[PDB]
Amino acid sequence: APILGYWKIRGLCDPIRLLLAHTGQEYEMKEYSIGPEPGYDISEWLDEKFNLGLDFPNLPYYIDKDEGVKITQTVAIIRYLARKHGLVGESDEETIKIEMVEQQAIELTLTCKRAFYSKDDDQFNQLKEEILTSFPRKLIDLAKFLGENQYIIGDRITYVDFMLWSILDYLRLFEESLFDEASSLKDYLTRIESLPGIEKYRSSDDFKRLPITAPMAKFGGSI
């Protein structure tokens, strides 16, 4: 059985788990606990970190002995899984669209990552301002690109829908007014959540006990 390793948070790994939930692929979830403040012990991870034969030892990792793969870096993992499960473009035209949206999703995600784990309120309010200021335009551009489509490239769901859904879900939880009346993207969120594999995952206890972030975060550190 393949193994996915990560913290006990939604975090970076969320789009991967949604992809795996949608496809129904069996895998073992290996979870690493973070101890309480102020020491935030991560000893479980450090005990395996160097012992797993990883090139770039980090979480998440994806290992599948049978297929002979060992992968770190969320986007490399999710693209690997997309190719395996047929959740990629079936023409260059689709691939271009997927990859443009993919970079937009990554930018949103990495800006939020920096905001959520800000050191002091100073740093946090600075990035919050950036988010509230720049993101509305980016969500409008995404809505305009999605149009009347069900998913990014149209009728068929692809891996980027999971990346986009994840970061929009985080933003909705961070500041609802970014999307409260943002109608098309709300329908998009609803549509992807209603897919049976994702619905089953989101209604499971394992998901409901996951905070968005690790406990030291300024946002999302608890359920």
Ligand X SMILES: N[C@@H](CCC(=O)N[C@@H](CS)C(=O)NCC(=O)O)C(=O)O
Contacts with ligand X, residue ranges (CB under 6 A): 7, 9, 11-12, 34, 40, 42, 109, 112-113, 116-117, 170, 212-214, 216
Please choose which of ligand X, a copy of itself, none residue 76 contacts, taking the beta carbon within 5 to 8 angstroms, the exact cut-off set by kind: a copy of itself
What proportions of the chain, in percent to the nearest 5, are helix, strand and coil?
Answer: 55, 10, 35
Residues 6+ apart with CB under 8 A from 149: 155
Per the document, the length of the chain is 223
How far is 56 from 51, CA to CA, in rounded Å? 12
- For residue 102, the partner it binds in a copy of itself, ligand X, none, with Cβ less than 5 to 8 A by kind, is a copy of itself
Closest of 109, 100, 206 to residue 158, by C-alpha: 100
Q: Residue 73 and residue 75: Cα distance in Å, rounded? A: 6
103 binds, among a copy of itself, ligand X, none (CB under 5 to 8 A by kind): a copy of itself
Chain residues 125-164 in contact with a copy of itself, contact rule CB under 8 A: 141, 144-145
Q: Record the tokens describing residue 46, joined without a space.
A: 């450090």
Whether residue 30 is annotated as binding a ligand: the answer is no
Minimum Å distance from CB 222 to a copy of itself? 27
SS3 188: helix
Three-class SS of residue 87? Answer: coil
Coil/strand/helix, residue 90: coil
Residue 99 as a binder of a copy of itself (CB under 8 A): the answer is: yes
- The residue among 154 and 215 lying less far from ligand X, judged by its C-beta, is 215
Is 23 a binding residue for a copy of itself by CB under 8 A? The answer is no
Annotation-wise, does 159 bind a ligand? no
Binding residues vs a copy of itself (CB under 8 A): 55-56, 69, 71-76, 79-80, 83, 92, 95-97, 99-100, 102-104, 106, 110, 114, 141, 144-145
